[PDB]
Design a protein around this ligand. Structure first.
Ligand SMILES: Cc1c(CO)cnn1-c1ccccc1
Length: 209
């Protein structure tokens, strides 16, 4: 059972704007995704100060950067609060319509793509370097779901059958054929130290063969 949904008209034109606009400062995607992971970890930590039973699905709060050359994927793993099914379909799409409309008005006013985080839609910066994005997430109050989109105005959602996460969000970036630089160890270490040095959670960058 794989359900296919259509993006909102405002989210669709933002995606095509990110896909089609010539813009060479593409590395800002990792800051936006790590900043998105840091917010999810803050929310589960806050909910735990008044309820220590919410870490039952995992006490550790960290962020993992796992590059893969054989599959040509960069994965950002966090043990944050996760996202529910209503989040993946209705909720965040409604929150993002205002920041989207504000982001375009800023772009015609002189702003550039790197300012996408101050409008709450920084996740779509992943499509600067990805031709397809997979999101595996697990919320304490919901099952494990798989989100996927390759632009075009549509996305899919299904119940994931893979490895149980316990709690968190896994963002898999299927890198474009000409964007394999973000699979290199020394490159990722440079973007992290430059853009996300003050993230208050341990960031472990994995290495491969
Ligand atoms: C996290 C997020 C926002 C807020 O920036 C807007 N859309 N999304 C999102 C991401 C992945 C899948 C479905 C929706």
């Amino acid at each position: 059972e794989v359900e296919t949904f259509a993006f909102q008209a405002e989210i669709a034109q933002l995606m095509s704007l990110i896909i089609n606009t010539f813009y060479s400062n593409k590395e800002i995607f990792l800051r936006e995704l790590i900043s998105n992971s840091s917010d999810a970890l803050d929310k589960i930590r806050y909910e735990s100060l008044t309820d220590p039973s919410k870490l039952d699905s995992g006490k550790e709060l960290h962020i993992n950067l796992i590059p893969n050359k054989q599959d040509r994927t960069l994965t950002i793993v966090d043990t944050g609060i996760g996202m529910t099914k209503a989040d993946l379909i209705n909720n965040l799409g409604t929150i993002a319509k205002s920041g989207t409309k504000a982001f375009m008005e800023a772009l015609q006013a002189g702003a550039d793509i790197s300012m996408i985080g101050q409008f709450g839609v920084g996740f779509y910066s992943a499509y600067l370097v990805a031709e397809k994005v997979t999101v595996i997430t697990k919320h304490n109050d919901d099952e494990q779901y798989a989100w996927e989109s390759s632009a075009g105005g549509s996305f899919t959602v299904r119940t994931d059958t893979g490895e149980p996460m316990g709690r968190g969000t896994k963002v898999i970036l299927h890198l474009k054929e000409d964007q394999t630089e973000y699979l290199e160890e020394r490159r990722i270490k440079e973007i992290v130290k430059k853009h996300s040095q003050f993230i208050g959670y341990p960031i472990t960058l994995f290495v491969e063969k």
